[PDB]
Amino acid sequence: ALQTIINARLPGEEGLWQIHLQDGKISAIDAQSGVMPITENSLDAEQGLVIPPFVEPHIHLDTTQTAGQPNWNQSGTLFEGIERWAERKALLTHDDVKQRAWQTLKWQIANGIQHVRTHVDVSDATLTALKAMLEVKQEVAPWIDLQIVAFPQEGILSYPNGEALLEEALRLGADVVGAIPHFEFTREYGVESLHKTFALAQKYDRLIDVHCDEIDDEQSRFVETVAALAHHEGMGARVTASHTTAMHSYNGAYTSRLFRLLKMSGINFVANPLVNIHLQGRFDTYPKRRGITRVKEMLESGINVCFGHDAVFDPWYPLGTANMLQVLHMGLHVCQLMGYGQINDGLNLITHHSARTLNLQDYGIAAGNSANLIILPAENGFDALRRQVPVRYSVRGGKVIASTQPAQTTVYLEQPEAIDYKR
Amino acid sequence: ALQTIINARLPGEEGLWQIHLQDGKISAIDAQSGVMPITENSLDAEQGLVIPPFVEPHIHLDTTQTAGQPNWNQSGTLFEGIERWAERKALLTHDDVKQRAWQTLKWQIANGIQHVRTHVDVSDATLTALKAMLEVKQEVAPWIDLQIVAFPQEGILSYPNGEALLEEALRLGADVVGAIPHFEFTREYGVESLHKTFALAQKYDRLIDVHCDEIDDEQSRFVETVAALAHHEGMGARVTASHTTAMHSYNGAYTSRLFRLLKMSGINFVANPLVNIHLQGRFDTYPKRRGITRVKEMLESGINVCFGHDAVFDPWYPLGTANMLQVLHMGLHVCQLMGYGQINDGLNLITHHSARTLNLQDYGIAAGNSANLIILPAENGFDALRRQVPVRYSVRGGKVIASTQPAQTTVYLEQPEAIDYKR
Ligand SMILES: O=C1NC=C(F)[C@H](O)N1
Numbered sequence A, B: 001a002l003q004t005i006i007n008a009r010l011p012g013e014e015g016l017w018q019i020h021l022q023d024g025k026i027s028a029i030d031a032q033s034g035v036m037p038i039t040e041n042s043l044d045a046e047q048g049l050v051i052p053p054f055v056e057p058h059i060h061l062d063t064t065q066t067a068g069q070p071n072w073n074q075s076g077t078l079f080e081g082i083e084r085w086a087e088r089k090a091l092l093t094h095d096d097v098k099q100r101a102w103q104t105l106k107w108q109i110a111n112g113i114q115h116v117r118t119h120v121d122v123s124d125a126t127l128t129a130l131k132a133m134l135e136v137k138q139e140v141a142p143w144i145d146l147q148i149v150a151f152p153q154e155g156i157l158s159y160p161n162g163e164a165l166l167e168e169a170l171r172l173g174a175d176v177v178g179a180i181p182h183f184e185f186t187r188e189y190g191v192e193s194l195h196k197t198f199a200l201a202q203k204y205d206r207l208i209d210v211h212c213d214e215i216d217d218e219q220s221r222f223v224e225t226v227a228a229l230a231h232h233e234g235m236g237a238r239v240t241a242s243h244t245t246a247m248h249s250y251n252g253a254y255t256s257r258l259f260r261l262l263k264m265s266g267i268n269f270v271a272n273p274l275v276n277i278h279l280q281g282r283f284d285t286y287p288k289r290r291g292i293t294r295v296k297e298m299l300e301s302g303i304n305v306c307f308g309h310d311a312v313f314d315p316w317y318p319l320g321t322a323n324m325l326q327v328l329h330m331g332l333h334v335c336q337l338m339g340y341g342q343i344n345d346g347l348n349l350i351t352h353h354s355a356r357t358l359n360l361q362d363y364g365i366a367a368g369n370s371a372n373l374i375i376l377p378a379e380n381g382f383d384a385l386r387r388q389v390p391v392r393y394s395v396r397g398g399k400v401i402a403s404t405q406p407a408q409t410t411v412y413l414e415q416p417e418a419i420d421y422k423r
């Protein structure tokens, strides 16, 4: 029955703070002028950093843990990945999807992630994975608020009954409408697919998250239609453009023109560093492009951008432990957001910016909000990122739902010495 | 008084193995047909992976821990980095260099690194850092065999008395002769500097490690002179070309021609993933090149290539905990060595290949060799890399010199559950 979080550091704030908890919510936040004593019912942050929970804005829980089944993606490309997934999709069973999704979700809970948006392939007349995921959503609710995107992986207009299946998925309860314009057979189908996606989102009052321009094609500009339709409907807050890796290859003049619309539209952007560095640049010899969208410029322009893990051991990515600080680490390097302040503020890319992408209404350390927060054994964002620290405690509804007793490293010199990699 | 390492897995080998130790050496290695019981004097690898120690083939211990002093490298480029370092170099003191070097060395010991090659800037008439590092080398010897490269950071022919200072550093005991041809004022000075470097290495019987073509200039081809001079002198095993990031920008025809010489010469290559992804591509707008040398092609051609951390919190890199598995993780992503086998064999890039780069004569788990080895709590290279595991035990001369009690993570669901991120 926790009543207070004491000795907490907060990003962008000086000193220590006390967070009072009442009835599963944050009742008040007060600055401390020194270190407070521990006591029963008090969770001691020990001058560590307290932040709202990590968020996973983009993952594929229906494909997670399937890498190599029945075959491996040899080329390491998005296109072969979809082909390898199609082979696995034909072998799906309800229980298998639930088991694999739950395996990755447990890693996420352990990693302080309390909000997850999973795409689920609905280019499947049986909607096997979707039915399984809707059950997982209910089962995992005490620990993670899971959003499900009805993702038409093989296209809306380019797959048999694609539009009907996408709508069926919404009627079954999917929270977000997906699309993949660059995978449609033609540019015209791509644009038309977006009009259909927006019409469905307005008909059912759902969010939108488009796999948008995930291709090293300087002519893949579906993002301008996503932003324009959102602006026209006055619904930018409910819309997300995932990937936009083609933007890495656009000329600068078009990008500058486009940025005005991106800002005016208010839509969100998701970059997936671990997967993008792996799948993009595969058609270059040397030099080889990085292939991540224009994260640095978006931040400078005040456009909301955040980071997702995208895949965890599946056709598009052979690694991962569903760790957001690891995703952030890769993104900061590839996007060259390596200034001290840029690294320190990096936490926003896996917390607040992602919460905005998911249109969350109860997020942040503020009075009145649910007591959902995590404690990192680090002094600030820079320190947490540099040392790739685990989540010491994850609190949800005012209760501890995960904890990590840190590793203990000792070197035996003339005398034993504890090493914590700090300075 | 350890007598045996039991239940050890070895890369590329099936089953479990027992490593018998006698008089600080490995006396014999025998396969097990099952799990052996623990007993006093036996170190149980617990079916974890046993490998020779991690190696750091390229780091700057004279600059480590100085990021932001007195100013930060704002552009994130090699060139500004050297300028910021020059400002810090003027403030060096003997004790400060020793303290900072020892701080990073302790992190390395904790991370199972028993072999380290540090470059030390000798473009300094006072040779302050070199004198300090020669003392550190002696002090750290019980735990790490430290090689010192006399690195003429500001050039040999382009800095006052550069050649005399480089030779003075060798007379004081530096183990390796360095150079930086692409930083010399002219291409001719660059080539001439290499002839002088090789002449010094033959005069003093020292190794060579050139900061070679660390620039996104398709015309920076000093590597062909390094390889040709090594081939002419029949000394490839003693020569290393660090960085060669310009190779990322070469046309393919010249690279193919060059590769024949690289193979024939037998020289070694070091890629520094964390720093290269950060400092390279800084003059591109979009698309932006990755800038790491041709690691994948070198491996396919049987050319020895390995990975270094290069910098730990200094003018050229604001992060790091001197962790080789983290360096490897970045390299596998940026170089797209993402096939299962490529990832699994990744350990060679931070163990055996690096030992060859340092021309080590006592390295590897083989009878007769010193009992220097480390134990990773993982099933194989892939698993160790994916989970970024710590070093459970580091053994040197048959004695434990470092150990890490792993972190313990628990999620509180309907029942508490331990999470180890394994599958
Ligand atoms: O279309 C896609 N499917 C799965 C992925 F992991 C990638 O995000 N893109």
Ligand SMILES: O=C1NC=C(F)[C@H](O)N1
Pocket: B060, B078, B153, B180, B211, B214, B275, B310, B311, B316
């Ligand atoms: O010339 C250089 N000095 C320092 C570095 F870290 C980089 O390796 N290159």
Ligand SMILES: [Fe+3]
Pocket: A058, A059, A060, A119, A211, A310
């Ligand atoms: Fe995706």
Ligand SMILES: [Fe+3]
Pocket: B058, B059, B060, B119, B211, B310
């Ligand atoms: Fe270097």
